[PDB]
Amino acid sequence: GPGMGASQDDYALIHKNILHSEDLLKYILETSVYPREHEQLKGLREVTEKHEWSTALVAADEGLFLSMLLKLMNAKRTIEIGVYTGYSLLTTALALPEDGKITAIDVNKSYFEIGLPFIQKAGVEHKINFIESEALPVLDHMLQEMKEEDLYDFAFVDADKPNYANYHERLVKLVRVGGAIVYDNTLWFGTVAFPEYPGLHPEEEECRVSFRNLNKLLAADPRVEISQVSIGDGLTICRRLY
């Protein structure tokens, strides 16, 4: 639509961190992440860091953390909403068993095509079913065809942040009891801690407001237990109770 430019260079928050120490974040990455990062993850991250939407790239320490959750819960079937160039998707596919399966949904397959050669070299493209679409129609179509036996173990939600509350209403039915839904970016550069925050792009401000509403909603939702984790840009792990 007509209006203000909404490129990454038009945003205010790009360089802001949720850790107070830039040195600490680099310590974590150099000590505990890069030595443990798959060579194809490294290549995909390095190409994505140059891309015009590099701000959206999941953080590499968050990557290893998502991998750990998947392995510890023995996830086998997962859904990812918001693929971009494929870092969390490649992380997920490397974590799952050889016969694991991922439903991966993104409006923009051209982004996916950037990471695809890395995912192919890693030997795990066969686990991925990529759907080029807005996520909400796909999720609604799943609700009508999904069997109890095929509920997902794990969902990673990282797409268009104002829609998370809408995705949640479907995902609490598409993930198994005991399964996990992980919402990325729920601390939104730390701006969620303030009732108003000057200087934001209108899309940044909409996400600040969206996440303040989502974080209250998830804390109050009896269908899940939650843990909000100050890693990357914040994430909230939800475990379906019924």
Ligand X SMILES: Nc1ncnc2c1ncn2[C@@H]1O[C@H](CSCC[C@H](N)C(=O)O)[C@@H](O)[C@H]1O
Our finding on whether 32 is near its own copies (CB under 8 A) is yes
Q: Mask 33-72, x = binds ligand H6N (CB under 6 A)?
A: ----------------------xx----------------
Which residue, 69 or 151, has its beta carbon nearer to its own copies? 69
Give long-range contacts, CB 8 A cutoff, 24+ apart: 174-178: 174/79, 174/139, 174/142, 174/143, 174/146, 175/79, 175/151, 175/240, 176/151, 176/152, 176/240, 177/240, 177/241, 177/242, 178/239, 178/240
Question: Among ligand H6N, Mg ion, its own copies, none, what does residue 215 contact (CB within 5–8 Å per kind)?
Answer: its own copies
CB of 127 to its own copies, least distance (A): 19
* Interface residue list for ligand X (CB under 6 A): 56-58, 81-84, 87-88, 105-108, 111, 134-135, 158-160
Binding positions for ligand H6N, 94-153, rule CB under 6 A: none
Our finding on whether 6 is near its own copies (CB under 8 A) is no
Cβ burial of 26 (10 Å; 0-12, 13-18, 19+) is: exposed
Q: Choose, by CB under 6 A, the member of 184, 192, 208, 215 that binds ligand H6N.
A: 184
